[PDB]
Amino acid sequence: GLEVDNNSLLRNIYSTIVYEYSDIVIDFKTSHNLVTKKLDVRDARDFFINSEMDEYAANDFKTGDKIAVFSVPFDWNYLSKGKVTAYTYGGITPYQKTSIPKNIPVNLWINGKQISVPYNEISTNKTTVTAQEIDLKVRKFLIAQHQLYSSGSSYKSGRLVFHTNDNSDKYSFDLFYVGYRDKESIFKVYKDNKSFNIDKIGHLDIEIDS
Numbered sequence: 001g002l003e004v005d006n007n008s009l010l011r012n013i014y015s016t017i018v019y020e021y022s023d024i025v026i027d028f029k030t031s032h033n034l035v036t037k038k039l040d041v042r043d044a045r046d047f048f049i050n051s052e053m054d055e056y057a058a059n060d061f062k063t064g065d066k067i068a069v070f071s072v073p074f075d076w077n078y079l080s081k082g083k084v085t086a087y088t089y090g091g092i093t094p095y096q097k098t099s100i101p102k103n104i105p106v107n108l109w110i111n112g113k114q115i116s117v118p119y120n121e122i123s124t125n126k127t128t129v130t131a132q133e134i135d136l137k138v139r140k141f142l143i144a145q146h147q148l149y150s151s152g153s154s155y156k157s158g159r160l161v162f163h164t165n166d167n168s169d170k171y172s173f174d175l176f177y178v179g180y181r182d183k184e185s186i187f188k189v190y191k192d193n194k195s196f197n198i199d200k201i202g203h204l205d206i207e208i209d210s
């Protein structure tokens, strides 16, 4: 697709509302899905979240486990009376009683030039945080402050790299991945339920280029 079209696409895709719940129990766990118990009430209907993830990642959970959710939906189901289920990818971490707010340093380069990013721009209260949560916070920031996906923007490529301080290769997201041009494919990059120990993330390295 063309630059202008990819921008409009991603701008709309990442404008999608994010779901954040710190304490919920898994009602059902299957090979590659987790379904929460009632989260709350949205538009008069009882709200539930279904998380799709690689079987390898799902192996980490069992029915009854207490978990936290931070994810973006790609579909909704209203076929059941007084009920609504949002479908998402990963975004699941073990329940954490006490919040531990921590800022994650960010290094940003736009078209080769380094740009300062405030100390408190990206943060999380989790000791085990998903790459998805960080990505969502990063893109919201970039869209609001650095013209990411904006109309009239010349950007065409970019990446968010998690520069961890361990022996693992650096995990990253492609900021201009468009898949099949819909939420189902674009958000599918979160299916691995990738997460990090907060003390292992040294900082984030972001590149955006035209």
Ligand SMILES: [K+]
Binding pocket: 172, 173, 174, 189
């Ligand atoms: K990726």
Ligand SMILES: [Zn+2]
Binding pocket: 107, 163, 203, 204, 205
């Ligand atoms: Zn780095």
